[PDB]
Design a protein around this nucleic acid. Structure first.
Ligand SMILES: [Mg+2]
Ligand SMILES: [Mg+2]
Ligand SMILES: [Mg+2]
Ligand SMILES: [Mg+2]
Ligand SMILES: [Mg+2]
Ligand SMILES: [Mg+2]
Ligand SMILES: [Mg+2]
Ligand SMILES: [Mg+2]
Ligand SMILES: [Mg+2]
Ligand SMILES: [Mg+2]
Ligand SMILES: [Mg+2]
Ligand SMILES: [Mg+2]
Ligand SMILES: [Mg+2]
Ligand SMILES: [Mg+2]
Ligand SMILES: [Zn+2]
Lengths: 139, 98, 68, 139, 102, 8, 112, 43, 55, 165
RNA sequence: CAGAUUGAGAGCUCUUUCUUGAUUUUGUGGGUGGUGGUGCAUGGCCGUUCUUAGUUGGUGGAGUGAUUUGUCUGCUUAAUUGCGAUAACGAACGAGACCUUAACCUACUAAAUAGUGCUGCUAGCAUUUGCUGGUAUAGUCACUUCUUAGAGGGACUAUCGAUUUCAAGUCGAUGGAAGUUUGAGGCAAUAACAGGUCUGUGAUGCCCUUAGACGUUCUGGGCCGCACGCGCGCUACACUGACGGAGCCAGCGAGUAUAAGCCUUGGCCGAGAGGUCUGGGAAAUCUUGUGAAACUCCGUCGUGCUGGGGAUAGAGCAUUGUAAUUGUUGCUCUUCAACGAGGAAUUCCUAGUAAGCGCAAGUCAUCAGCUUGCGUUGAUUACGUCCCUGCCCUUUGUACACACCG
């Protein structure tokens, strides 16, 4: 079983639960205050768990690719901003939230700074994510 | 135009010896890149020469093309007090190629 | 519409009056034949002439045609 | 071994299908077809399967890589690559009598399984915001 | 400075002279027993400029659409540097410019 | 109409 | 559509697409009064309705009624469409697109 | 050239000009002390 | 004195910072591919430069 | 200096456009037809087509020597890197540029338009042109301006061939 | 220089005596420069009649003639385009042909700036030899299918049914990548308009001005100014929706050096906007798979001027630029207005079309609610007519021909 053999949407809900129950991920102190993007108008509705779920998405997204940077992560989770009377536009997400997640994730494992830029997945990152996939599909 | 005698001289030993002169149309340019003087001086000094039938002036794409008349070689022969061995450079009879 | 023009209508009937024995009822054979019979400047015009010549040939076997 | 490689196309989406001899592996960009994200269109790629019967895929494994186009446009490119790959494998490594049988059922159901749609976007012309639409006129 | 894998990059606006020089060099790289790679057709670049037809500002809004296609081809040769340069002078054409990189 | 009129 | 069929299934237990076919044949007006006015004057004339226009006007009327019933209404569009199709399938005059169908064929009777 | 004449001469003078000029031009066509030394040798 | 005032205002990064190659105009300049030509001068030189109308 | 491919091929074209107008203004009286820029190693061959290659190469080639100097001094080119050749146009009647410049030298001499207009209609056809049409528009002594077309032979108007023939 | 003066560290001017040296000061002529006037003096260009389908000569017939027929009753077509009728016969321009682009080619030609399978080397999961990856500019591999582009091929309404003057054609199927001129454009006739531009031109004739300039330059303001009428548009009036998370797919393009600073990844700071340090790319190599938005899934909201809508305004934080005040623009909090689907009227549109939805390029130091293109999702309804409206043709009337603006 691999990460690619399980649906993405319910895999993240399972990896989010583990990272919260594991408790080793260091959560910055502003997670209850900040909004994810400048294009957003309200903070996330899942105040206690949104950071864990986003870190699960970042870890899973990096698994399928090669040397994705933190600037690319802002573009990925960014959306259309609601300019009032001007037309909509795509705006990048917050840099600190994405940079903190990968930095928080780097001393808890799964990733490391990759050569030629970006952040690769760690030697142990494949080992424990593939584990989560197995504990996802038994039901 | 008020040109110092010394700066006007260099304008004459450039229009003689290479009897053609090119000057970009910018009056405030510090240096015409081939006569160490103001660019405006070159235009107005040669505007007098074409005004007195010593150089042809042609203008195309914001550029001045000054060429020396046969009557102008004799004028710089005497006023410059140069030897009557002239042949600036475009008159050295290099002869064309067929 | 698919109305052929005069540059293809008159050029096709000149072919029939001149090379009827070598012509046929097949477009593919006619298309190759007209490349050695006529000097056609463009491929599209070559196909157009042979396609109307074939129609006239197909019509000649059913009776007399006008213009040939 | 017995390997054939084909491709299907929609507007811009192109899905390259590799059909090899094997146990019947059918993946979308390295992911099982049972997890396509256009959920409402999951039966579009199920159509080339259930029409002939899953027994035809015992001996062949299919791995496609679909890029370009959009979310919906990629599904039609994928289902075409699968359908064309199965036919191309039979023509080369099976008798042509079976290949003509398979080609008959697919065409009798939907032409787009084997024949690529030739529609492309019309260019925009000045004097309007679209191909045929024009700026509103005033008198 | 003996044998050398040398790349020649060809760019021009017109394809006939580009393909003649490209084919002539490939031909000359055939009778000379020189292994060759090419020609490689790079994706053509369409330099498009869309201006207004009217020199003034009156009339229907009509636009010109000028174009300048640039085609680029690279050919890889395995020969000493003296040999490759003289091939270039053999296939010199006014329209096509040549740059040689080791 | 117009006509540059001076003050100084 | 996927959700509407399930609602049509839990109600009346019939085949949802059988109800759809019944609702379309019962919603298309069979005679509409076209206008034949000669440049300004009213001159209404009763004419017949083609099967194609009869079928495809039923779909136009069925979806228009569902759209307006779900506007500013807690009932969702899938279950507003479900309410519209079931009522029109059984020919009830309560449904939209059955009022319209009767009114079209009623005016045509007042033109012959 | 708005007159009924000047088209008499516009044509006859124009055509004899070209016939005389194409033929005349088409038969002739075949056929078959420095400075630096003065401003440096300041000995 | 006067030389420090005459033509003293900066004339960079502006529309007056550049001009047409041909007519030295400031409006309707084309900067793509470093043309630096007015849109009117471009039309009368487009064939010479190598720009043609195809589509 | 280091210039990209898109901006380099465009620069070569722009250089040609400015050079062509320079000859039209300077050598208008000598029937300038066109210019061909033949790039070559170390040398820059420039072939100019004019009705009269004596006015360009006059008084021991004084003008051509004094004219090539105006290009070395204006484009910062090496003195040996450019060579200019003057070539006679073979068929003067088939060059509309020569015919238009020649007409101007006649109209400016006070010759009547009708005699001048028919002088190019027959010279073009005499050279073997399939067709020719001359339009002259403007004002002549009269306050109102007018245009007159003088056609001859066969002329095509629409499609690609007008760009070819 | 210094002081006065000045908005000014303008010797502009005034006190002040220094400096330069026949370049130059005054008058005459003559110039020159004008985004000054005249598009009702002009060139060139463009728009329009009109992209509708129209225009023209040779011979022959008619007429004293100017002229006419040819250039037409009918059918057909997008078409003066064809069949046909025929004092006409035989032709040219325009249309069509032509050119560019998009869709097909497992058939050629190759590709380490494209991709793939194997193979070296390598990771995770079940251990069956399997499934996902990373790496690979020496594996000194194999291949051209996807990608690119050059030489070609392919569609000509092909075959078969109907109707028709059995003609031009039209409508259906089958095959087909493509059967609406295959889709879309580029070019585009004979003349012409007092159409628009001398505010694109060192394109111009003439008139005006030319030293207290209407030339040019510096400083500041204005082109944004606000009781009002109108046009091209953007957000919206909600639940087929707003938010909050999660999923996550394009194409057209552009990009620099001793500059006067280009596209900018990656790392590190910042809630953001943004800052900083390095590196790649003059480019199928790097930005870039531009991981775009609509969209899809799971949640909160629950018909409420409500979490729709986001004007107006207060306070604060950054970027560009000499300079942001009359907020250039971006970000944060708060303030949260009309609008609850719009009268008489009126616009655009027939298939990857309309409608949404974003993205790039132009303008650009900064600013896109604008244009030019591109792609994503993707329909309803005709495939007909002259009823309205505009244009074309024929007949007809005319005291018009500067042609009804007569
Ligand atoms: Mg970024
Ligand atoms: Mg998102
Ligand atoms: Mg005449
Ligand atoms: Mg055409
Ligand atoms: Mg006018
Ligand atoms: Mg006659
Ligand atoms: Mg008749
Ligand atoms: Mg049309
Ligand atoms: Mg059409
Ligand atoms: Mg000012
Ligand atoms: Mg408009
Ligand atoms: Mg959402
Ligand atoms: Mg900057
Ligand atoms: Mg009518
Ligand atoms: Zn210009």
């Amino acid at each position: 079983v691999s990460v690619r053999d399980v649906p993405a949407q319910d895999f993240i809900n399972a990896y989010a639960q583990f990272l919260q129950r594991q408790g080793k991920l260091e959560v910055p102190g502003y997670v209850d205050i900040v909004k994810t993007s400048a294009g957003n108008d309200l903070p996330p509705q899942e105040a206690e768990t949104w950071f864990y779920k986003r870190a699960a998405s970042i870890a899973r997204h990096i698994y399928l690719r090669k040397q994705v940077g933190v600037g690319a992560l802002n573009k990925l989770y960014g959306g259309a901003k609601n300019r009032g009377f001007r037309p909509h536009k795509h705006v990048d997400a917050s840099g600190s939230i994405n940079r903190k997640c990968v930095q928080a994730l780097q001393k808890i494992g799964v990733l490391e700074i990759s050569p030629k830029g970006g952040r690769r997945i760690s030697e142990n990152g494949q080992r424990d994510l593939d584990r989560i996939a197995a504990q996802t599909l038994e039901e | 135009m008020l040109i110092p005698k010394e700066d006007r001289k260099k304008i004459h030993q450039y229009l003689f010896q290479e009897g053609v002169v090119v000057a970009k149309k910018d009056f405030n340019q510090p240096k015409h890149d081939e006569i160490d003087t103001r660019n405006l001086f070159v235009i107005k000094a040669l505007q007098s020469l074409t005004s007195k039938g010593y150089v042809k002036t042609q203008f195309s794409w914001q550029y001045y093309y000054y060429t020396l008349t046969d009557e102008g070689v004799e004028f710089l022969r005497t006023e410059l007090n140069i030897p009557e061995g002239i042949l600036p450079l475009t008159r050295l009879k290099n002869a064309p190629a067929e | 519409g698919r109305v052929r023009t005069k540059t293809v209508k008159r050029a096709s009937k000149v072919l029939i009056e001149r090379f009827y024995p070598k012509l046929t009822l097949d477009f593919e054979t006619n298309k190759r034949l007209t490349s050695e019979i006529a000097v056609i400047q463009s491929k599209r015009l070559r196909n157009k002439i042979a396609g109307y010549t074939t129609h006239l040939m197909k019509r000649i076997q059913k009776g007399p045609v006008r213009g040939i | 071994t017995q390997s054939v490689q084909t491709f299907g196309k929609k507007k811009t989406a192109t899905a390259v299908a590799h059909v090899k001899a094997g146990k019947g592996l059918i993946k979308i960009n390295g992911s099982p077809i049972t997890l396509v994200q256009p959920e409402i269109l999951r039966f579009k790629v199920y159509e080339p399967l259930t029409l002939v019967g899953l027994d035809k895929f015992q001996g062949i494994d299919i791995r496609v890589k679909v890029t370009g186009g959009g979310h919906v446009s990629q599904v039609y490119a994928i289902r075409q690559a699968i359908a064309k790959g199965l036919v191309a494998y039979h023509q080369k490594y099976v008798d042509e009598a079976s290949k003509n049988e398979l080609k008959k059922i697919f065409a009798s159901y939907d032409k787009t399984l084997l024949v690529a749609d030739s529609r492309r976007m019309e260019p925009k012309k000045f004097g309007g915001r679209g191909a045929r639409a024009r700026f509103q006129k005033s008198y | 400075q003996q044998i050398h894998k040398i790349r020649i990059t060809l760019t021009s606006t017109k394809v006939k002279q580009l393909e003649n020089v490209s084919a002539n060099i490939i031909r000359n790289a055939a009778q000379y027993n020189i292994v060759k790679k090419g020609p490689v057709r790079m994706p053509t670049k369409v330099l498009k400029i869309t201006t207004r037809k009217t020199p003034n500002g009156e009339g229907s809004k009509t636009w010109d659409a000028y174009e300048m296609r640039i085609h680029k081809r690279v050919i890889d040769l395995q020969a000493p540097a003296s040999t490759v340069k003289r091939i270039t002078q053999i296939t010199i054409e006014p329209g096509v410019d040549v740059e040689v990189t080791i | 109409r117009k006509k540059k009129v001076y003050t100084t | 559509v996927k959700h509407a069929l399930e609602i049509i299934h839990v109600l009346t237990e019939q085949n949802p697409i059988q109800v759809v076919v019944d609702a379309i044949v019962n919603s298309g007006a069979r005679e509409d009064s076209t206008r034949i006015g000669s440049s300004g004057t009213v001159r209404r004339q009763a004419v017949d309705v083609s099967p194609l226009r009869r079928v495809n006007q039923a779909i136009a009327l069925l979806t228009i009624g569902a759209r307006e019933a779900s506007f500013r209404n807690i009932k969702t569009i899938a279950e507003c469409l479900a309410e519209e199709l079931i009522n029109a399938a059984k020919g009830s005059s309560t449904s939209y697109a059955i009022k319209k169908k009767d009114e079209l064929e009623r005016v045509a009777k007042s033109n012959r | 050239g708005q007159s009924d004449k000047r088209e008499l001469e516009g044509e006859v003078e124009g055509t004899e000009d070209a016939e005389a000029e194409l033929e005349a031009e088409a038969e002739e066509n075949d056929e078959s002390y420095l400075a630096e030394l003065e401003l440096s040798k300041q000995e | 004195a006067h030389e420090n005032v005459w033509f003293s205002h900066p004339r960079n990064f502006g529309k007056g910072s550049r001009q047409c190659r041909h007519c030295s105009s400031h409006s309707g300049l084309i900067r793509k591919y470093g043309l630096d030509l007015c849109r009117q001068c471009f039309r009368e030189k487009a064939a010479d430069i190598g720009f043609n109308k195809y589509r | 200096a280091i210039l990209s491919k898109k901006k380099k091929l465009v620069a070569d074209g722009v250089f040609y456009a400015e050079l062509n107008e320079f000859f039209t203004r300077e050598l208008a009286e000598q029937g300038y037809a066109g210019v061909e820029v033949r790039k070559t190693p170390s040398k820059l061959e420039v072939i100019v087509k004019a009705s009269n290659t004596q006015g360009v190469l006059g008084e021991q080639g004084r003008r051509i020597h004094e004219l090539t100097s105006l290009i070395v001094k204006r484009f910062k080119l090496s003195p040996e890197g450019i060579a200019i050749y003057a070539e006679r146009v073979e068929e003067r009647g088939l060059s509309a540029a020569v015919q238009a410049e020649a007409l101007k030298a006649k109209l400016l001499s006070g010759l009547p338009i009708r005699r001048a207009a028919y002088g190019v209609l027959r010279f073009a056809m005499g050279a073997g042109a399939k067709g020719v049409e001359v339009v002259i528009s403007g004002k002549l002594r009269a306050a109102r301006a007018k245009s007159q077309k003088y056609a001859d032979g066969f002329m095509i108007h629409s499609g690609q061939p007008t760009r070819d023939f």
